[PDB]
Ligand binder design. Structure first.
Ligand SMILES: [Mg+2]
Ligand SMILES: [Mg+2]
Ligand SMILES: [Mg+2]
Ligand SMILES: [Mg+2]
Ligand SMILES: [Mg+2]
Ligand SMILES: [Mg+2]
Ligand SMILES: [Mg+2]
Ligand SMILES: [Mg+2]
Lengths: 138, 59, 48, 164
RNA sequence: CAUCCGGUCGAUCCUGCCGGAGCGCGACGCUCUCCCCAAGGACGAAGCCAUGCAUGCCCGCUCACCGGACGCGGCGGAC
RNA sequence: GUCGCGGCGCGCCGAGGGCCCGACGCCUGGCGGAGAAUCAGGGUUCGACUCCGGAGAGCGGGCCUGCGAGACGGCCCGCACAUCCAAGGACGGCAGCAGGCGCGGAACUUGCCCAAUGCGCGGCGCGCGAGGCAGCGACGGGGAGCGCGCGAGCGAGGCGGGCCCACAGCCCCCGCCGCGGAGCCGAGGGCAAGCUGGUGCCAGCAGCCGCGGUAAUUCCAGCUCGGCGAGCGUCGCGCGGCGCUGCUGCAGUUGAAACGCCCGUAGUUGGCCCCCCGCCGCCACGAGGAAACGGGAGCGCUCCAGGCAGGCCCGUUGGAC
């Protein structure tokens, strides 16, 4: 047929699979290493940085912030989910930033955003949104 | 309803004294328990004594 | 202009629904033994 | 290291692959009502045990009747089932096992066995009394509703002597 | 313990991928009535260390003090 | 020379050895195995950590003692750090147990004891941060509950007595009095679950499709409802989904994809035929070789996760395989 099938052909099948498994995009991304070096989070679930600038077919301006990772010193952009949560974020403040649902790719209509703010000054953003915790220490 | 355990009957009183863990005797009404001493202080004394030379009985 | 511009009825103080299995027993009779159309206006009209 | 590291442990239930399924929800609520189940973990436990029995029966059935291992394991399994009351006494062939159902497992719970004896008004009443240690098996009192009674112990179940 | 579902069109059949549905390992958030078991500074810092402890025992050798100190000697410290 | 064979080292001689059945070189966020996660079958990923084996004690070297060490809670040197100094001098190695700084998304008491298991030295014992007990501990696993019914009863909790304990707890038992407390997500579809008031492509939701420009079934709130439940949700990774890596089991006219054609080595594949001999593969059985994990026989820790037990007249009780 179109595949080798002899009784003494294990080596050829092994090398064929070895060579051809590299054509899958996901497998390359996972086991090539370029993504690992390029990813700012360096394979971590979430990282810690410092705020430095608050910035902005659906036509809805979105609020985000620029962050500088402490452990890596590079710059990224993060988005503030809830309604009216930008006020809780002040310039030059420490934040904890995680990823979106999709690992790497952008989510939704936000252009070039792949990170999320979840904790500010050591207090959960969602908790502050519901008034469970308060920022009177800051 | 049910309670089970173990006993130990000795032929003579002396045999009990020779063959018996000390804490068992203390639990029983046989002898008197010396006041406890912290092993930490004992180790401190041992190290301090090892520090000295010749006759180290002063401390 | 101010962010959160978009951002009160007295709470209906009623006995708490039972917890544990007793809650499970409530639904069993709610859907079979008791007359029900689940969630339409007319059902809510009747209960008032 | 600590001796506690060598202790074993395992889970005891399986969760459905498809959570939202109307017939399944209806059947599970139905069973919970008839047998007064506290939550949906008991059903998963019953399914786990049934799956284990079914897999053992399958593996044994795949072999020839006159196989030493087949005889050994089938005899053990049948003896266990008969002792536990899940399977009827008159059934001795391995085929009958594969048709079993979790209702059979449920019917041997302590609440059920005391209710069928008329000693309790309902499964919920049975659970309430069991939690209050008012029942006894043989000479001992059991306060676990899920306790499973054996066939030889069914007639020895009574009310606790010390119960008020 | 052999399962699929939504998205290209004015409608239809395919290829093809995107997303959802399950389990496990960790971190974050909210919350927590009772009992049993139970891991716990490993994750490109094998980076830096106040403070205390982690290796002793005794048959041989007593003109020490009132035989017990200490010391020489022996075994162990390479587990 | 070594305990000892050996290019292990030295002198002489000759030239060889390895490689597409992949040498040499480079890289690794490379300790290995027994094993762990996942689940028709076939497989994929991981394997710091409990048992075994290996290596190391800041980096690089050297050495004495001793049967046994290239030892580091042994010594000497260089390098990098660090401490006291009455300035001439002296002195250190927590990847041991607690504890501290730095780092990070991430990780516990500077506690008690040798009573159990063992080791060392020994006659009626000493020592052991090995180890054991306790403390913090929503990593995680298992078992009960916030009612039943027309009156009673029962927990949690409190106060005393036992039992246990090296001493203290905790569990369990006996008396008196007696707090019943549910959250996290969502209601357009995938996917189970619908009415009022605000806002007006703004604010915001939305993993994907999409909503929002005057009824918004999707934003913000109230009511009601749904799922799991002492737990629920979010982020990253692995398996599955996926017959989208295909040995079982993909596709190649037009969707992505048959080298422009021929010869040809390595490689792979090769018609039929002899009944009994030899060899290779193959099938079956067997010997030998650690357990733990996994499977599995038996046993009512009140059940269970577990563990190897218990009553009596016990297979020689058992711990089979
Ligand atoms: Mg390495
Ligand atoms: Mg080892
Ligand atoms: Mg070494
Ligand atoms: Mg050394
Ligand atoms: Mg050492
Ligand atoms: Mg050290
Ligand atoms: Mg074309
Ligand atoms: Mg084409």
């Amino acid at each position: 047929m179109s595949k080798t099938s002899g009784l003494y052909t294990a080596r050829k099948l092994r090398t064929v699979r070895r060579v051809n498994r590299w054509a899958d995009k996901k497998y390359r991304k996972a086991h090539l290493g370029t993504w690992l070096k390029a990813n700012p989070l360096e394979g971590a679930c979430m990282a810690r940085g410092i705020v430095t600038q608050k910035i902005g077919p659906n036509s809805a301006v979105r609020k985000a912030v620029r962050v500088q990772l402490t452990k890596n010193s590079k710059k990224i952009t993060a988005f503030v989910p809830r309604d009216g949560s930008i006020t809780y974020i002040d310039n030059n403040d420490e934040v904890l930033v995680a990823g979106f649902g999709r690992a790497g790719r952008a989510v939704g209509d936000i252009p070039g955003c792949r990170f999320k703010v979840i904790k500010v000054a050591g207090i959960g953003l969602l908790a502050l949104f519901l008034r469970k915790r308060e920022k009177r220490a800051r | 309803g049910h309670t089970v355990g173990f006993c130990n009957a000795y032929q003579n009183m002396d045999a009990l004294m020779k063959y018996e863990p000390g804490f068992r005797k203390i639990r029983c009404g046989l002898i008197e328990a010396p006041k406890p001493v912290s092993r930490k202080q004992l180790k401190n004394l041992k190290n301090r004594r090892l520090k000295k030379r010749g006759t180290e009985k002063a401390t | 202009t101010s962010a959160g511009k978009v951002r009160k009825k007295e709470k209906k103080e009623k006995p708490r629904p039972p917890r544990g299995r007793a809650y499970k027993r409530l639904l069993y009779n709610k859907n079979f033994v008791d007359d029900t159309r689940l969630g339409p206006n007319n059902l809510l009209i009747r209960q008032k | 290291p600590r001796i506690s590291r060598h202790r074993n442990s395992s889970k005891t239930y399986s969760t459905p692959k498809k959570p939202f399924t109307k017939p399944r929800l209806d059947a599970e609520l139905k069973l919970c009502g008839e047998y007064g189940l506290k939550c949906k973990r008991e059903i998963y436990r019953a399914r786990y045990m049934l799956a284990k029995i079914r897999r053992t029966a399958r593996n044994l059935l795949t072999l020839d009747e006159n196989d030493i291992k087949r005889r050994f394991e089938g005899a053990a399994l049948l003896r266990r089932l008969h002792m536990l009351g899940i399977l009827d006494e008159e059934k001795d062939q391995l085929d009958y096992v594969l048709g079993l159902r979790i209702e059979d497992i449920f019917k041997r719970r302590l609440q059920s066995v005391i209710v069928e004896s008329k000693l309790a008004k309902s499964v919920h009443h049975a659970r309430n009394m069991i939690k209050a240690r008012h029942i006894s098996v043989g000479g001992q009192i059991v306060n676990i509703p899920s306790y499973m009674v054996r066939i030889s112990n069914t007639s020895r179940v009574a009310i606790a002597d010390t119960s008020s």
